Design a protein around this ligand. Sequence first.
Ligand code: ADP
Ligand code: ADP
Lengths: 52, 375, 375, 31, 31, 54, 54
Amino acid sequence: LNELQALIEAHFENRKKEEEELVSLKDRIERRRAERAEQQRIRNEREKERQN
Amino acid sequence: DEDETTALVCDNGSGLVKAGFAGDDAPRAVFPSIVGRPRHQGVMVGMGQKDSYVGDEAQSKRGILTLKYPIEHGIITNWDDMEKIWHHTFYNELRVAPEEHPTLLTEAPLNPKANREKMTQIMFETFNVPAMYVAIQAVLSLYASGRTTGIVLDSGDGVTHNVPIYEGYALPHAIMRLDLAGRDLTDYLMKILTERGYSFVTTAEREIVRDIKEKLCYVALDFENEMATAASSSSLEKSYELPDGQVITIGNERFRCPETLFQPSFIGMESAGIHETTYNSIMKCDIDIRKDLYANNVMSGGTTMYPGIADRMQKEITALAPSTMKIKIIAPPERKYSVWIGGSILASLSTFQQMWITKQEYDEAGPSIVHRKCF
Amino acid sequence: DEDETTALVCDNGSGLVKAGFAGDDAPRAVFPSIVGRPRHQGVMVGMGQKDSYVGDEAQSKRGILTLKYPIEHGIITNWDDMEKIWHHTFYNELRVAPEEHPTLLTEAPLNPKANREKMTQIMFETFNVPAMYVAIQAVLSLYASGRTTGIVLDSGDGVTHNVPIYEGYALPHAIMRLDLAGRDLTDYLMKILTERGYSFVTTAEREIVRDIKEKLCYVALDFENEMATAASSSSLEKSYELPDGQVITIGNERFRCPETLFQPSFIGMESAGIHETTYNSIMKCDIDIRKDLYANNVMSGGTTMYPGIADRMQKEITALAPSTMKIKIIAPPERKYSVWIGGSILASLSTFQQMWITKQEYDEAGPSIVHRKCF
Amino acid sequence: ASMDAIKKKMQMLKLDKENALDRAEQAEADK
Amino acid sequence: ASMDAIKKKMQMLKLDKENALDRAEQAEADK
Amino acid sequence: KLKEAETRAEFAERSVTKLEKSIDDLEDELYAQKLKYKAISEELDHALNDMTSI
Amino acid sequence: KLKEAETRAEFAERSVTKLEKSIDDLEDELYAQKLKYKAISEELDHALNDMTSI
Ligand SMILES: Nc1ncnc2c1ncn2[C@@H]1O[C@H](COP(=O)(O)OP(=O)(O)O)[C@@H](O)[C@H]1O
Ligand SMILES: Nc1ncnc2c1ncn2[C@@H]1O[C@H](COP(=O)(O)OP(=O)(O)O)[C@@H](O)[C@H]1O
């Protein structure tokens, strides 16, 4: 059953690699979007400061 | 004030609670299953005023209270309010100490287990009752009604049980249990009274509608002919006096509320109606069972007290039932009290003494004992 | 869409409808045997909304529909709803009009005659099918499984027929028709779930309980041992998501539902279970038949997909069966779909081209012809 | 990921035992 | 990190083979 | 001041729609992630239930 | 118009704030769901590599 071997490894290797990479790749995108949220917080504070 | 070391009986449901001692033919008193609490800020001081009021106290001072019941469609959730009701009921109204008397409490056999477990547990752990027995309401109904056989329609405030019993045996495969009850009928009546120009919202307003329902509502023998006239003419209208002197006049709405039991769609429920579910409980049973259940449609609980309910139920079943069979409704004066009376009978039967859970057995087994000894 | 006048094949019972064309290895589409209707008054105008919904349409919009099954306990009673199902089943999804294609439908010898007569009559008089055949589902399961001999225990939605076949011959005196099926297993589960605090009454609630059963329940190999642990520890409990965000936790109730198959008394049936009926179908046959039927117990249809059922049955049957002899179960992944697959195999056999009831024969003989021609 | 690797290993071991079992049964049947 | 159910029951199927084979061999040796 | 309040409001409203859109996209991703999680755990639990035995 | 634009600006600042919170909640929920979902279910598939061995 070369197929059980092909599947036992294909399931694990293809997914752990692709999937864990998506976790960390998106974690960085998300962190950057979270920075955008912080920058909006900063933008709101700056607009208020400029207007007294 | 009682003269014997007898068992206590208390049919405490989502509506009202009936209580007295085993061996009598009636409860000493009936109270609403209510614990009340102030919904207003006090201004005067030295006015007494309780944190909570129970039973008659809760209803008597209701003008400034919000009132709640502990039982949700037959299930106890607020066990602390049950404690208040049981304490008052046994200690002040029956004037007994549960510590010195066995106590019998009631519930449908298909009621969620937590209900039977808390009834057994609270009476043993907070009241120290020497013994307990959670009873089957259908059994109690048959014992009060003079039967061993029939379909018990306890059509109460919480749930309609609808269970066939034959020769003292349950026929559980045929219980057409239904989530249609007196508490829904009251809310329905409030909406249709609103349609007529009489809005109701608050607890006091709800108690008033419940009182309107209990005195004015009826089923009738024929809903279509009854509404043809009631919705067209003042001749079938009946007034009710509200406590503030205002008068509410009710027409076909007077029967639309009880009609809901036969027409569940009135409250958004998907159901065949109490008479078809009764019919199916009979039909689901074996051929040699069916004949005896057709002849024995048995009433207990509230809603069985609406004028025309006993007769509409007999007519609905005979209209679905086969010929030859004599279809009969058993609707005794012991209506609404059939379960309390049966409780007295069961608690006192000599053939039931071994069925009581003793405190020692309870303490050794824990709350789960109710399923070993009761049901 | 078809390049040949291939027969259409469909396994259509009290549960689900499986359909596709002869020559495939699977139905192309699976629908529930449901016709749904609104149980509410429309409020908005220009909303579309159908008078009736069929199959998957009926389940998709079920929040406000009452859902009925035209087939109950193995038999079609609502022929009007079946015409709507057959059209959807064969034409809307397969795009094949029966007018130019023979059709093969299923049942069992103890299935009342009207079922086979209406299946044959509807396809000939409403769909103008050029030919019909009614097959025993056991025949089809055995063709799909590569067998001519065995007991097909079809444990379906409304009925279990348990039909023995030996070397391609029916042994009808040994068919054990049992009033226990998946619909009753659903009923049991909602009652035991009620004991845990989760009551299910309406159509939507019923369909949810069937989903809980299909995904969470299992048979296991030894229910007394399974219960000893499941009743003692949360480690065997499983959560199910109700489509409103509530979670229902199911414990030993998780196998007590399918356990009914090994304990029919749970639903009021006078039976010891499906392994007893498998045993009796074999026992009723001459011993020179029995040895091969015991060695080839066959699972088909519904409930065959509960974890542990194929293995539980082999254990339960070998426990009743004589020793020395090998007792074995045939339970391929082509389970529950084996009846449809056998229909494909049978409809397309060159030797089966002489087994079809033609339209001309039908028109001359009338609806009763199926009783003369099928089996 | 479905445990197809063992649906397949299961079948292989099932065949190995079924064959050993066929032999166990024959070996006893042969007398 | 293997599954206990799989590891064990795979071994049980291997055991049906090993045990059936031992039965086959002993039975055949005598029969 | 109006031009600034309106400009800031419309701009900030773009930040509202950008954050909102990103929230919906993250939710579609979350859903897809939930779906894959679900599908995987279930595919494994399914297959495992089928393959608990052997 | 300024108070209204300011209400809109403030609305948008608040809406943005609510969405700054909801974007971060989605950034953290998508993160957490991926971090726990692919990390657990992909791990469960790694475990498949071993679970289905034998
Ligand atoms: N005249 C009446 N007509 C219809 N129902 C009534 C009447 N009087 C009382 N009831 C109803 O009786 C119910 C309470 O009695 P009961 O059913 O014996 O309690 P339990 O459910 O524990 O058995 C309440 O729903 C109340 O509205
Ligand atoms: N995993 C499962 N668990 C429990 N029951 C199942 C499962 N899969 C299928 N069934 C049941 O299959 C039944 C329909 O089976 P079926 O045998 O094809 O009817 P029939 O053959 O008589 O036309 C439904 O009641 C469904 O609940």
